[PDB]
Amino acid sequence: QSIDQLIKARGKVYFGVATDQNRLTTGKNAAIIKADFGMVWPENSMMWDATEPSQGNFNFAGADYLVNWAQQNGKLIGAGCLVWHNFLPSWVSSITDKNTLINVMKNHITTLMTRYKGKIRTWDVVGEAFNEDGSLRQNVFLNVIGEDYIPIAFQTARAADPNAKLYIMDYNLDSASYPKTQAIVNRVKQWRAAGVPIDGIGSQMHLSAGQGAGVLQALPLLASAGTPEVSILMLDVAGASPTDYVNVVNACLNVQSCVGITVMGVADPDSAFASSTPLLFDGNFNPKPAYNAIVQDLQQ
Numbered sequence: 001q002s003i004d005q006l007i008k009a010r011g012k013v014y015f016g017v018a019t020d021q022n023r024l025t026t027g028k029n030a031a032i033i034k035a036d037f038g039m040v041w042p043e044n045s046m047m048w049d050a051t052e053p054s055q056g057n058f059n060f061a062g063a064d065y066l067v068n069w070a071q072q073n074g075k076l077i078g079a080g081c082l083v084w085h086n087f088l089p090s091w092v093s094s095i096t097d098k099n100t101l102i103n104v105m106k107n108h109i110t111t112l113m114t115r116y117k118g119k120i121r122t123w124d125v126v127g128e129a130f131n132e133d134g135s136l137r138q139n140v141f142l143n144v145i146g147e148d149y150i151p152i153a154f155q156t157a158r159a160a161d162p163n164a165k166l167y168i169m170d171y172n173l174d175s176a177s178y179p180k181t182q183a184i185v186n187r188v189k190q191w192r193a194a195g196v197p198i199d200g201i202g203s204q205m206h207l208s209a210g211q212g213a214g215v216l217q218a219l220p221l222l223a224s225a226g227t228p229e230v231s232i233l234m235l236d237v238a239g240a241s242p243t244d245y246v247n248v249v250n251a252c253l254n255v256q257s258c259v260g261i262t263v264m265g266v267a268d269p270d271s272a273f274a275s276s277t278p279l280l281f282d283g284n285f286n287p288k289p290a291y292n293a294i295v296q297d298l299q300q
């Protein structure tokens, strides 16, 4: 049975998965997504390198394919990441002038969000903005613009598509005692008090074995920032233990503002961490014990 259908019956929005044209045309990915998942994110086709490889010149073929496939198959769409240090073209990284970088960043956000206006449920606007000690990461945006880049990004995104839910996301938010987890909460509270339109915090849960248990404390901490939504993103677990996966799912169920869960992929061989067999389907596209454990946990 379908973990998306089951999680919806427990009052959540979706169980989703990252994908793209290459996946959808191979393996059993499209069939599994159609049956078992309710939302898709572009794994890479919306990243900056992919969408704006030279200044002002956009590439939308790959993202368009994903968006169209999702619409044809009745799936919600999440997308990102609009502003982060990964997948960043060299032409962006070499900018030194504050006003230029603001305009570059605003044009990137507005162009992408306008193209898909009204079709995207969730946009991950800012990603990986924090250092492990909780200070802000000194990426090109912070170095050139300063800390205003985060409010500017969210303000620009809200104007481009007021219907989308706007998220900040990060990894290593999995322990409630870790400084990064505390810092994103405190800063999101401050930004929201200044009227910055941060609708969500997304937790990029690339987990090692045994880390599911701590998410039961970390996810309510993230929700305490007061955003209308929190999400679990990029989920995979080294070893794919049912205990870890069920602990992650129950953290979602326990946190009223947690709208859903997105796994990093469908089948183990297609993970960037394949040797850790960290996904819910094996290399034959058969569901693994963790998939069945999630089914049993969600059944009523």
Ligand SMILES: O=[N+]([O-])c1ccc2nn[nH]c2c1
Pocket (backbone or CB within 6 Å): 017, 018, 041, 042, 043, 044, 079, 080, 081, 082, 124, 232, 233, 234, 235, 262, 263, 264, 265
């Ligand atoms: O949850 N995800 O797997 C996922 C993948 C790529 C993304 N880019 N922005 N947000 C993302 C979430």
